[PDB]
Amino acid sequence: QTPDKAKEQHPKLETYRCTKASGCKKQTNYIVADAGIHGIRQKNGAGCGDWGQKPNATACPDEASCAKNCILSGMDSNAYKNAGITTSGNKLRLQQLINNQLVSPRVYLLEENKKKYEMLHLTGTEFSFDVEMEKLPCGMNGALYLSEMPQDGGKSTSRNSKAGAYYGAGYCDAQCYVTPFINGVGNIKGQGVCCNELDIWEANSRATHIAPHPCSKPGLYGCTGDECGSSGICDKAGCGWNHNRINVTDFYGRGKQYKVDSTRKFTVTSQFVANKQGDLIELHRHYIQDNKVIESAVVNISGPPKINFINDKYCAATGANEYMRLGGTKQMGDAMSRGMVLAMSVWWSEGDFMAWLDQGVAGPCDATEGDPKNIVKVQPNPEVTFSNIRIGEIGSTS
Numbered sequence: 502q503t504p505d506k507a508k509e510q511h512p513k514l515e516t517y518r519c520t521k522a523s524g525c526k527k528q529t530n531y532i533v534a535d536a537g538i539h540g541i542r543q544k545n546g547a548g549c550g551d552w553g554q555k556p557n558a559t560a561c562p563d564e565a566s567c568a569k570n571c572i573l574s575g576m577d578s579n580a581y582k583n584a585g586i587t588t589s590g591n592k593l594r595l596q597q598l599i600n601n602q603l604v605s606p607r608v609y610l611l612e613e614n615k616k617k618y619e620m621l622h623l624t625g626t627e628f629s630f631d632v633e634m635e636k637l638p639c640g641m642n643g644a645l646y647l648s649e650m651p652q653d654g655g656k657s658t659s660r661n662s663k664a665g666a667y668y669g670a671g672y673c674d675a676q677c678y679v680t681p682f683i684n685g686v687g688n689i690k691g692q693g694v695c696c697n698e699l700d701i702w703e704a705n706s707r708a709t710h711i712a713p714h715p716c717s718k719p720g721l722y723g724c725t726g727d728e729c730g731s732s733g734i735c736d737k738a739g740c741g742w743n744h745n746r747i748n749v750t751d752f753y754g755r756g757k758q759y760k761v762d763s764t765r766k767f768t769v770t771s772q773f774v775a776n777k778q779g780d781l782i783e784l785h786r787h788y789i790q791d792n793k794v795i796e797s798a799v800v801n802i803s804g805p806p807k808i809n810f811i812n813d814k815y816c817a818a819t820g821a822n823e824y825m826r827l828g829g830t831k832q833m834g835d836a837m838s839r840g841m842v843l844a845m846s847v848w849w850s851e852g853d854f855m856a857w858l859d860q861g862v863a864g865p866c867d868a869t870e871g872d873p874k875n876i877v878k879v880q881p882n883p884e885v886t887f888s889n890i891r892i893g894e895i896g897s898t899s
């Protein structure tokens with residue numbers, strides 16, 4: 502689409518870069534809402550297409566027409582606030598609903614210049630954030646992850662691409678979903694928009710999940726046919742790590758009966774260990790609550806190695822077949838070494854209620870409380886605050 506001339510007032514967010522020798526140095530970054538949230542419409546107010554489909558065929562018979570006919574409106578602070586996005590110092594607050602409307606924001610981290618995404622190279626490094634999960638019940642998903650999105654939002658791929666990173670263009674992930682816009686241009690062919698993805702944090706106050714999702718194609722790839730499916734180019738399922746699934750049900754949850762208490766602030770530290778060749782080999786996780794390091798628990802089911810971290814042996818032993826098939830941990834680390842975009846979001850699912858995250862073996866939720874209709878009964882304003890993002894040498898961010 503083509504941005505209008507309305508001012509874009511991206512919320513500011515302080516973040517830190519750290520080393521064992523110098524500590525953590527504060528940096529200014531900006532938050533940008535996804536392109537879709539800005540509002541992309543034709544001149545008669547109609548939209549340019551819905552999630553899961555190609556762009557409206559009348560406004561977008563081709564790319565140039567699509568770019569001319571679909572306008573993206575800039576977002577002032579108010580627009581951000583009404584989209585459920587606000588920031589304060591080093592904190593980012595994401596609200597699922599504002600004035601009774603479903604806003605469910607998805608935002609990306611921008612470099613201080615606002616023209617490009619801050620590309621994070623995590624292989625061999627450490628990443629820490631503080632999170633407030635009390636207001637996220639069964640069925641909710643407060644996510645902090647990385648996607649190998651184009652740094653300029655896809656601008657360089659075409660003369661018709663104008664939104665750029667400045668307006669949140671270029672989203673992609675390992676589900677290869679068909680979105681109306683791809684790389685800032687009309688997705689005339691209806692391709693699935695794929696890319697390597699690292700889910701560092703997918704949670705609610707009842708269950709937490711970690712999951713690297715490798716893809717055999719670097720950067721953003723427009724898949725066609727079977728390239729988009731289960732046996733295609735991206736690992737949809739991922740190699741997951743959820744304490745409940747490896748039978749350690751008292752590790753995380755609401756209250757005093759859990760090692761990490763989801764009703765109170767805590768720190769999440771992730772360490773991406775590389776071997777001598779600089780390849781990713783292991784994903785480690787530990788938490789900090791009440792000034793105490795809480796280490797992850799070792800697998801408590803038979804099958805997988807007795808370790809408290811992700812690795813190819815573990816992944817293969819837990820049935821992540823696509824993960825292994827697409828290159829496993831090393832393939833994931835290559836995408837991380839090339840550089841990826843930090844995405845943060847809040848959402849729910851009318852379709853499966855996030856059962857894969859917090860029901861049966863994944864957690865303590867029944868089969869219906871996670872329904873969005875029930876979610877609002879348990880908690881009228883689901884929300885999540887991610888803050889104090891620190892990236893740097895292993896051993897120096899928390």
Ligand SMILES: OC[C@H]1O[C@@H](O[C@H]2[C@H](O)[C@@H](O)[C@H](O)O[C@@H]2CO)[C@H](O)[C@@H](O)[C@@H]1O
Pocket residue numbers: 605606607642644646674675676698700703714739845846847848
């Ligand atoms: O279901 C749409 C929903 O997706 C969220 O991104 C997912 C990504 O699709 C998936 O591949 C990965 O495994 O987890 C992330 C984070 O949950 C996105 O964050 C939402 O805004 C979006 O509504």
Ligand SMILES: *[C@@H]1O[C@H](CO)[C@@H](O)[C@H](O)[C@H]1NC(C)=O
Pocket residue numbers: 543545547557558559560
């Ligand atoms: C596509 O946009 C045109 C307006 O140019 C409108 O007539 C039509 O309803 C839109 N299609 C859909 C499927 O919304």
Ligand SMILES: *[C@@H]1O[C@H](CO)[C@@H](O)[C@H](O)[C@H]1NC(C)=O
Pocket residue numbers: 748801802803
């Ligand atoms: C889960 O662990 C408990 C021991 O803490 C044990 O009683 C039970 O059999 C284990 N179940 C599985 C799925 O292995």
